[PDB]
């Protein structure tokens, strides 16, 4: 008998989600990056693996405007890789020359990036280009969603700015003085 | 099958068969014609009658040939002369037969028959 927490069987939450997707291709891409991860001591690949094993919802959108906004002098020559789907921002007027690598390009994002003199890359290609991730730029998109506003603090606790779940927005809906 | 109004249900058909009124039954129980007769009337099958000559094609009694004594439609039986079995007390009893296991060697001929045959041949060859 020993007094160890969780009996030394403590589960490790520090790990990479085992993905259940069914596109045979994700599983394969993943075989690839498992290789690159154990046999390459490059953080970049390990990173790619963690983020490609993401919850369907945990993959977040990259927009052309997002890329454009994050660009340094060196960011421009560098391969841009998002772990996610890349999409067009209709409100981006001129589109730079880009070599981008994502999982998925909205056909609009593709058309505009290509017709601007750009190149679209897939991770099997990226592997071949720079396994160490040399001169590569890994884009982590910003995280927004509606769910987030119902979370946080509860709706009507002191200083709660969180949103209530309501079936309609009207003067009559949870917009009237509560029972105070 | 081509037609929505054709019942494919086991139930409905079995029903039709066993619920068959006499006249339709006679049709349902019918025999196959001899090579000769087939050729003569240009007709494959014929509904059996009580005066016909037949050959038992299949059964312990296969191979025997004779006249049809009784068409007992209710019992679903055809009786053929000398197709009986004898009982230990010395009492004879007929042995029933399913038409579709018979073959028609010689028909009972008469006007109505000939007309039927004629219609069949008619749609057939034409």
């Amino acid at each position: 008998a020993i007094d160890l927490h969780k009996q030394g069987r403590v589960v490790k939450r520090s790990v990479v989600r085992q993905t259940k997707s069914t596109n045979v291709y994700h599983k394969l891409l993943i075989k690839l990056y498992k290789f690159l991860v154990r046999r390459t001591d490059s953080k970049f690949n390990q990173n790619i693996l963690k983020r490609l094993s993401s919850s369907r919802l945990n993959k977040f959108p990259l927009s052309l405007s997002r890329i454009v906004k994050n660009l340094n002098e060196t960011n421009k020559e560098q391969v841009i890789v998002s772990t996610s789907t890349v999409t067009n921002d209709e409100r981006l007027l001129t589109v730079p020359k880009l070599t981008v690598c994502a999982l998925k390009f909205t056909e609009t994002a593709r058309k505009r990036i290509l017709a601007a003199g750009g190149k679209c890359l897939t991770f099997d290609q990226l592997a071949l280009k720079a396994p160490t991730g040399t001169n590569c730029f890994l884009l982590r998109a910003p995280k927004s969603r509606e769910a987030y506003r119902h979370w946080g603090k509860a709706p009507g606790q002191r200083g709660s700015h969180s949103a209530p779940y309501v079936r309609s927005e009207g003067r009559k809906f949870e917009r009237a003085h509560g029972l105070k | 099958k081509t037609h929505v109004e054709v019942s494919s249900a086991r139930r409905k058909q079995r029903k039709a068969h066993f619920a068959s009124p006499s006249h339709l039954r006679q049709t349902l129980m019918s025999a196959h014609l001899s090579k000769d007769l087939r050729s003569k009337y240009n007709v494959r099958s014929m509904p059996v009658r009580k005066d016909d000559e037949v050959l038992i094609v299949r059964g312990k009694f296969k191979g025997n040939k004779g006249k049809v004594t009784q068409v007992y439609r209710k019992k679903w039986a055809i009786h053929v002369e000398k197709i009986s079995k004898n009982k230990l007390n010395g009492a004879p009893y007929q042995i029933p037969l399913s038409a579709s296991q018979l073959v028609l060697t010689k028909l009972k001929l008469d006007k109505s028959r000939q007309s039927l045959l004629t219609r069949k041949a008619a749609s057939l060859k034409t």
Binding site: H150, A154, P155, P164, Y165, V166, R167 | -
Partner: protein, 103 residues
Amino acid sequence: MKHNNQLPVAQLRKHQQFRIKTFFNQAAQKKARLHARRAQAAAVFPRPTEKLQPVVRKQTQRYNKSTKLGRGFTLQELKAAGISAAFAQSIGIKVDHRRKNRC
């Protein structure tokens, strides 16, 4: 009544058992409509399927920008066409007597 989820909105409060509607006829119904239409053509053969419909603007501020098929022609219009309502009707034209031209 337990968690943070949105206040339910009762549905089955009355006896709905008597009040349910089922959509299986839909399958056959579509079909029926088809044949109806077709049998119309055949019986109407030399003539067109749908009778003549004028056009107007829609009735709402938001709909004004769009175009809509009217039920009938304005007597004013038949006049400028030179047709009597009766005749236009013998022709396959659709007439509507309560509609008026303000433009």
